[PDB]
């Protein structure tokens, strides 16, 4: 599976399928682009879930919840701007 | 599409012992999908604007730098480069 | 930076991804719809 080859838990392959779906006429997507998108997605999700598990005063969350997600992103004002973009 | 399983895998990566509800991963699905859309759209915009019919490491990297705010852009670019190296190598 | 965003309204968050507020009927996500395995098409290894 191409996902582990990139060390990415997310599907670089289905991701590249989506990329092809969202290209212009004759608009192709390189494998490097597929894995790059999967990697940025994995890192963003990793930071968001890291702070969501840590989205609390005790810095640990048993079950990640929408509120924990708002705290992770909003409190991560970088992610606040990124999502609000 | 369907990425919730890989969402949980990344959650284990960051937090091997953290569970998460159904709607919380729905929110993650929306978040990842929309950021994925932003990146792919910017990359295809550059490809269409340029003679590059291809979307490559250059395209996704430039899109990541353009969209993400500062340190986020730096981290995302570094991770994309690292994963491109991993996959290509 | 934590309190500065709180004093102001976070209406954007309130309407983001079906809301970020805690709700009911939110089961611990069980698993896939039987589509967990990744998939490709014939043109991933195409040169750039």
Residue numbers in the entry:
A (entry chain N): 18 to 102
B (entry chain O): 35 to 123
C (entry chain K): 18 to 65
Direct quotes from the study:
The human Tat-interactive protein, 60 kDa (TIP60) complex, a fusion of the yeast nucleosome acetyltransferase of histone H4 (NuA4) and switch/sucrose nonfermentable related 1 (SWR1) complexes, is involved in both histone acetylation and H2A.Z-H2B histone exchange and is essential for cell viability, playing a role, among other cellular processes, in gene regulation and DNA double-strand break repair. Within the complex, the EP400 protein functions as a major scaffold, making interactions with all the functional and structural modules, a role similar to that of the Eaf1 subunit in the yeast NuA4 complex and of the Swr1 subunit in the SWR1 complex, the two subunits of which EP400 is a merge.
With the goal of structural and functional characterization of the TIP60 complex, we purified the native, endogenous complex from K562 cells that had been genome engineered to produce a tagged version of the enhancer of polycomb homolog 1 (EPC1) subunit specific to TIP60 (28). After tandem-affinity purification from nuclear extracts, biochemical and mass spectrometry (MS) analysis showed the presence of 17 distinct subunits. Our structural model of the endogenous TIP60 complex does not include the trimer independent of NuA4 involved in transcription interactions with nucleosomes (TINTIN) module, and only a small segment of the HAT module could be traced (EPC1), as they are flexibly tethered to the rest of the complex. As is also the case for the yeast NuA4 complex, the HAT module is flexibly tethered to the P400 subcomplex through a previously identified region within EPC1 (49–54). TRRAP (Tra1 in yeast), which is the largest subunit in the complex and is involved in its recruitment by transcription factors, is a major feature in all structural studies of the yeast NuA4 (49–54).
